[PDB]
mmCIF file of C-alpha atoms and ligand atoms in Angstrom:
data_model
loop_
_atom_site.group_PDB
_atom_site.id
_atom_site.type_symbol
_atom_site.label_atom_id
_atom_site.label_comp_id
_atom_site.label_asym_id
_atom_site.label_seq_id
_atom_site.Cartn_x
_atom_site.Cartn_y
_atom_site.Cartn_z
ATOM 1 C CA UNK A 1334 120.153 114.907 86.816
ATOM 2 C CA UNK A 1335 117.215 113.932 88.980
ATOM 3 C CA UNK A 1336 114.248 113.534 86.609
ATOM 4 C CA UNK A 1337 113.498 111.361 83.587
ATOM 5 C CA UNK A 1338 113.604 113.383 80.377
ATOM 6 C CA UNK A 1339 110.706 111.511 78.776
ATOM 7 C CA UNK A 1340 108.235 111.095 81.615
ATOM 8 C CA UNK A 1341 109.220 113.881 84.021
ATOM 9 C CA UNK A 1342 109.187 111.748 87.178
ATOM 10 C CA UNK A 1343 112.274 110.777 89.162
ATOM 11 C CA UNK A 1344 115.010 108.623 87.689
ATOM 12 C CA UNK A 1345 116.685 105.454 88.945
ATOM 13 C CA UNK A 1346 119.495 106.744 91.201
ATOM 14 C CA UNK A 1347 117.021 109.181 92.790
ATOM 15 C CA UNK A 1348 114.667 106.304 93.639
ATOM 16 C CA UNK A 1349 117.503 104.209 95.113
ATOM 17 C CA UNK A 1350 118.767 107.178 97.133
ATOM 18 C CA UNK A 1351 115.330 108.208 98.423
ATOM 19 C CA UNK A 1352 114.493 104.611 99.339
ATOM 20 C CA UNK A 1353 117.644 104.241 101.397
ATOM 21 C CA UNK A 1354 116.779 107.310 103.464
ATOM 22 C CA UNK A 1355 113.092 106.362 103.671
ATOM 23 C CA UNK A 1356 114.272 102.940 104.844
ATOM 24 C CA UNK A 1357 116.193 104.147 107.923
ATOM 25 C CA UNK A 1358 113.322 106.507 108.677
ATOM 26 C CA UNK A 1359 110.757 103.688 108.811
ATOM 27 C CA UNK A 1360 113.152 101.708 110.990
ATOM 28 C CA UNK A 1361 112.705 104.383 113.682
ATOM 29 C CA UNK A 1362 109.081 105.395 113.090
ATOM 30 C CA UNK A 1363 107.907 101.796 112.743
ATOM 31 C CA UNK A 1364 105.526 102.856 109.956
ATOM 32 C CA UNK A 1365 104.858 100.457 107.066
ATOM 33 C CA UNK A 1366 106.916 101.052 103.910
ATOM 34 C CA UNK A 1367 105.471 99.717 100.656
ATOM 35 C CA UNK A 1368 106.966 99.361 97.174
ATOM 36 C CA UNK A 1369 105.304 99.169 93.770
ATOM 37 C CA UNK A 1370 106.907 97.741 90.629
ATOM 38 C CA UNK A 1371 104.888 98.679 87.545
ATOM 39 C CA UNK A 1372 105.894 97.150 84.210
ATOM 40 C CA UNK A 1373 104.112 97.688 80.879
ATOM 41 C CA UNK A 1374 102.575 94.581 79.370
ATOM 42 C CA UNK A 1375 103.439 93.366 75.831
ATOM 43 C CA UNK A 1376 105.404 96.514 75.217
ATOM 44 C CA UNK A 1377 107.628 95.082 72.472
ATOM 45 C CA UNK A 1378 104.546 94.134 70.488
ATOM 46 C CA UNK A 1379 103.194 97.621 71.197
ATOM 47 C CA UNK A 1380 106.154 99.290 69.550
ATOM 48 C CA UNK A 1381 105.930 96.886 66.627
ATOM 49 C CA UNK A 1382 102.301 97.779 65.877
ATOM 50 C CA UNK A 1383 102.227 101.513 66.607
ATOM 51 C CA UNK A 1384 105.885 102.550 66.470
ATOM 52 C CA UNK A 1385 108.456 103.988 68.861
ATOM 53 C CA UNK A 1386 106.675 107.350 69.237
ATOM 54 C CA UNK A 1387 103.421 105.769 70.432
ATOM 55 C CA UNK A 1388 105.301 103.665 72.986
ATOM 56 C CA UNK A 1389 106.916 106.843 74.340
ATOM 57 C CA UNK A 1390 103.492 108.477 74.459
ATOM 58 C CA UNK A 1391 102.109 105.375 76.223
ATOM 59 C CA UNK A 1392 104.862 105.643 78.827
ATOM 60 C CA UNK A 1393 104.061 109.276 79.525
ATOM 61 C CA UNK A 1394 100.371 108.413 79.936
ATOM 62 C CA UNK A 1395 101.334 105.589 82.305
ATOM 63 C CA UNK A 1396 103.511 108.069 84.228
ATOM 64 C CA UNK A 1397 100.578 110.544 84.403
ATOM 65 C CA UNK A 1398 98.286 107.798 85.717
ATOM 66 C CA UNK A 1399 100.668 106.795 88.507
ATOM 67 C CA UNK A 1400 101.363 110.359 89.619
ATOM 68 C CA UNK A 1401 97.596 110.973 89.583
ATOM 69 C CA UNK A 1402 97.184 108.132 92.087
ATOM 70 C CA UNK A 1403 100.364 108.843 94.109
ATOM 71 C CA UNK A 1404 100.183 112.287 95.665
ATOM 72 C CA UNK A 1405 101.516 112.472 99.250
ATOM 73 C CA UNK A 1406 104.742 114.158 100.328
ATOM 74 C CA UNK A 1407 106.511 110.963 101.441
ATOM 75 C CA UNK A 1408 105.778 109.267 98.095
ATOM 76 C CA UNK A 1409 108.134 109.086 95.119
ATOM 77 C CA UNK A 1410 107.528 107.954 91.526
ATOM 78 C CA UNK A 1411 110.535 107.091 89.410
ATOM 79 C CA UNK A 1412 111.400 105.649 85.966
ATOM 80 C CA UNK A 1413 113.226 102.531 87.171
ATOM 81 C CA UNK A 1414 113.807 101.050 83.697
ATOM 82 C CA UNK A 1415 113.183 101.421 80.011
ATOM 83 C CA UNK A 1416 109.672 100.082 80.586
ATOM 84 C CA UNK A 1417 109.304 99.899 84.392
ATOM 85 C CA UNK A 1418 108.104 102.322 87.050
ATOM 86 C CA UNK A 1419 108.936 102.072 90.751
ATOM 87 C CA UNK A 1420 107.081 104.106 93.407
ATOM 88 C CA UNK A 1421 107.779 104.531 97.088
ATOM 89 C CA UNK A 1422 104.742 104.567 99.424
ATOM 90 C CA UNK A 1423 106.140 105.644 102.765
ATOM 91 C CA UNK A 1424 103.904 105.232 105.807
ATOM 92 C CA UNK A 1425 101.505 103.110 103.714
ATOM 93 C CA UNK A 1426 100.481 99.602 104.728
ATOM 94 C CA UNK A 1427 99.964 96.673 102.364
ATOM 95 C CA UNK A 1428 96.144 97.091 102.202
ATOM 96 C CA UNK A 1429 96.367 100.724 101.112
ATOM 97 C CA UNK A 1430 99.172 99.958 98.644
ATOM 98 C CA UNK A 1431 96.912 97.441 96.863
ATOM 99 C CA UNK A 1432 94.136 100.030 96.475
ATOM 100 C CA UNK A 1433 96.608 102.403 94.816
ATOM 101 C CA UNK A 1434 97.731 99.594 92.512
ATOM 102 C CA UNK A 1435 94.184 98.639 91.525
ATOM 103 C CA UNK A 1436 93.410 102.275 90.716
ATOM 104 C CA UNK A 1437 96.567 102.489 88.561
ATOM 105 C CA UNK A 1438 95.918 99.175 86.860
ATOM 106 C CA UNK A 1439 92.259 99.906 86.120
ATOM 107 C CA UNK A 1440 93.029 103.398 84.824
ATOM 108 C CA UNK A 1441 95.678 102.171 82.391
ATOM 109 C CA UNK A 1442 93.284 99.494 81.091
ATOM 110 C CA UNK A 1443 90.599 102.123 80.406
ATOM 111 C CA UNK A 1444 93.004 104.577 78.743
ATOM 112 C CA UNK A 1445 91.978 103.231 75.290
ATOM 113 C CA UNK A 1446 88.236 103.557 75.903
ATOM 114 C CA UNK A 1447 88.320 107.129 77.281
ATOM 115 C CA UNK A 1448 90.660 108.496 74.593
ATOM 116 C CA UNK A 1449 90.339 107.433 70.986
ATOM 117 C CA UNK A 1450 94.016 107.924 70.119
ATOM 118 C CA UNK A 1451 95.392 105.598 72.838
ATOM 119 C CA UNK A 1452 95.791 101.936 71.947
ATOM 120 C CA UNK A 1453 94.685 99.174 74.357
ATOM 121 C CA UNK A 1454 97.252 98.633 77.091
ATOM 122 C CA UNK A 1455 97.675 97.054 80.514
ATOM 123 C CA UNK A 1456 100.259 96.962 83.310
ATOM 124 C CA UNK A 1457 101.451 94.367 85.808
ATOM 125 C CA UNK A 1458 102.149 95.435 89.406
ATOM 126 C CA UNK A 1459 104.115 93.805 92.215
ATOM 127 C CA UNK A 1460 103.862 94.958 95.802
ATOM 128 C CA UNK A 1461 106.100 94.414 98.805
ATOM 129 C CA UNK A 1462 105.694 95.921 102.282
ATOM 130 C CA UNK A 1463 107.935 96.294 105.321
ATOM 131 C CA UNK A 1464 106.242 96.352 108.732
ATOM 132 C CA UNK A 1465 107.592 97.217 112.180
ATOM 133 C CA UNK A 1466 107.875 93.575 113.243
ATOM 134 C CA UNK A 1467 109.427 92.339 109.988
ATOM 135 C CA UNK A 1468 113.094 91.281 109.954
ATOM 136 C CA UNK A 1469 113.756 91.651 106.199
ATOM 137 C CA UNK A 1470 116.317 94.085 104.802
ATOM 138 C CA UNK A 1471 116.057 96.730 102.086
ATOM 139 C CA UNK A 1472 117.441 94.396 99.427
ATOM 140 C CA UNK A 1473 114.890 91.750 100.400
ATOM 141 C CA UNK A 1474 112.165 94.385 100.231
ATOM 142 C CA UNK A 1475 113.109 95.328 96.672
ATOM 143 C CA UNK A 1476 113.516 91.652 95.806
ATOM 144 C CA UNK A 1477 109.999 90.779 96.930
ATOM 145 C CA UNK A 1478 108.501 93.489 94.760
ATOM 146 C CA UNK A 1479 110.236 92.461 91.529
ATOM 147 C CA UNK A 1480 109.448 88.827 92.245
ATOM 148 C CA UNK A 1481 105.758 89.668 92.743
ATOM 149 C CA UNK A 1482 105.958 91.666 89.508
ATOM 150 C CA UNK A 1483 107.408 88.541 87.861
ATOM 151 C CA UNK A 1484 104.554 86.475 89.281
ATOM 152 C CA UNK A 1485 102.131 89.002 87.789
ATOM 153 C CA UNK A 1486 103.644 88.526 84.336
ATOM 154 C CA UNK A 1487 103.579 84.728 84.710
ATOM 155 C CA UNK A 1488 99.994 84.179 85.818
ATOM 156 C CA UNK A 1489 98.691 86.249 82.935
ATOM 157 C CA UNK A 1490 99.443 89.936 82.678
ATOM 158 C CA UNK A 1491 97.244 92.854 83.764
ATOM 159 C CA UNK A 1492 97.010 92.153 87.487
ATOM 160 C CA UNK A 1493 98.445 93.067 90.881
ATOM 161 C CA UNK A 1494 100.397 90.501 92.910
ATOM 162 C CA UNK A 1495 101.339 91.024 96.557
ATOM 163 C CA UNK A 1496 104.561 89.389 97.802
ATOM 164 C CA UNK A 1497 104.560 87.005 100.728
HETATM 165 N N1 C2E B 2504 100.861 106.995 100.116
HETATM 166 C C1 C2E B 2504 99.675 107.216 99.548
HETATM 167 N N2 C2E B 2504 98.627 106.450 99.841
HETATM 168 C C2 C2E B 2504 97.433 106.624 99.272
HETATM 169 C C3 C2E B 2504 97.248 107.730 98.310
HETATM 170 N N3 C2E B 2504 95.983 107.684 97.905
HETATM 171 C C4 C2E B 2504 95.364 106.660 98.540
HETATM 172 N N4 C2E B 2504 96.236 106.023 99.357
HETATM 173 C C5 C2E B 2504 95.954 104.856 100.175
HETATM 174 O O1 C2E B 2504 94.712 104.281 99.746
HETATM 175 C C6 C2E B 2504 93.786 104.220 100.809
HETATM 176 C C7 C2E B 2504 92.378 104.487 100.257
HETATM 177 O O2 C2E B 2504 92.215 105.891 100.055
HETATM 178 P P1 C2E B 2504 90.886 106.425 99.300
HETATM 179 O O3 C2E B 2504 90.075 105.247 98.870
HETATM 180 O O4 C2E B 2504 91.332 107.476 98.299
HETATM 181 O O5 C2E B 2504 90.156 107.175 100.547
HETATM 182 C C8 C2E B 2504 90.860 108.053 101.393
HETATM 183 C C9 C2E B 2504 90.585 109.468 100.930
HETATM 184 O O6 C2E B 2504 89.332 109.491 100.214
HETATM 185 C C10 C2E B 2504 90.459 110.288 102.190
HETATM 186 N N5 C2E B 2504 91.692 111.093 102.285
HETATM 187 C C11 C2E B 2504 92.735 110.823 103.080
HETATM 188 N N6 C2E B 2504 93.702 111.755 102.915
HETATM 189 C C12 C2E B 2504 93.290 112.625 101.994
HETATM 190 C C13 C2E B 2504 93.849 113.843 101.338
HETATM 191 O O7 C2E B 2504 94.955 114.294 101.680
HETATM 192 N N7 C2E B 2504 93.074 114.461 100.442
HETATM 193 C C14 C2E B 2504 91.866 114.027 100.085
HETATM 194 N N8 C2E B 2504 91.181 114.715 99.144
HETATM 195 N N9 C2E B 2504 91.312 112.923 100.632
HETATM 196 C C15 C2E B 2504 91.954 112.204 101.582
HETATM 197 O O8 C2E B 2504 90.397 109.404 103.286
HETATM 198 C C16 C2E B 2504 90.357 108.036 102.809
HETATM 199 C C17 C2E B 2504 91.183 107.178 103.750
HETATM 200 O O9 C2E B 2504 92.500 107.004 103.280
HETATM 201 P P2 C2E B 2504 93.563 106.139 104.139
HETATM 202 O O10 C2E B 2504 92.847 105.575 105.340
HETATM 203 O O11 C2E B 2504 94.802 106.953 104.318
HETATM 204 O O12 C2E B 2504 93.897 104.920 103.153
HETATM 205 C C18 C2E B 2504 94.257 105.263 101.823
HETATM 206 C C19 C2E B 2504 95.734 105.319 101.609
HETATM 207 O O13 C2E B 2504 96.338 104.370 102.490
HETATM 208 C C20 C2E B 2504 98.436 108.556 98.025
HETATM 209 O O14 C2E B 2504 98.367 109.514 97.216
HETATM 210 N N10 C2E B 2504 99.573 108.256 98.668
#
C-alpha cells in the first residue's frame, strides 16, 4: 500500500503525502527543499529491442542506483510513474542536489559497461529547489521540476537541468 511492487521504493501517493508534510516543515525550518524528476530515456525503444522483462529489470537497476545515492533520513525515493522516479531531498540546497543528480546520471550511463547483461541506457533529470526567501508554492515547486525534466528531454537526453 506504500511501496512499488516492482522496484521496492515508495509509490506515488506516498511521495505526494510525504512532500506535503516536508513542505510545511521547511516553511518553519527555512531549510532548502529540493526535488528530482528522473525519467528513463528512449524507454519505448528499449522495450522494443530487449522486451518487457529487460525494461522492468532496467527500472529496478535505476531504482537501485538512486537509492544508492539517496541515503539520508529526510529523503524519499518513489516510483512516480510507469517510467519516472521522483525523490525528495529535504534540507538539501540546489548545489548539493545537482551533485546527487550527476552521480545518478553517470552511474546509469555506466551500467552497461560494468555489467555485461545490462543494455546501454541513460536518464534525464530535472531539479527544482525551494529556499527560505522564495515565494513559490508546492505546486510551483513540482511544476518547475517536471518542466526542467522536459527541458532535459528537449535539449538532447542524458543530462541534468536545473529549473530557474
Ligand atoms: N539529502 C542528501 N544529500 C546528499 C546525499 N549524498 C550527498 N548529498 C549532497 O551532496 C553533497 C556532496 O556530498 P559528497 O560529495 O558525498 O561529500 C560529502 C560526504 O563525503 C561527507 N558526508 C557528509 N555526511 C555524511 C554521512 O552521513 N556519511 C558519510 N559516509 N559521509 C558523509 O561530507 C561531504 C559533504 O557533504 P555536504 O556538505 O552535506 O553536501 C553533500 C550533500 O548536500 C544524500 O544521501 N542525501
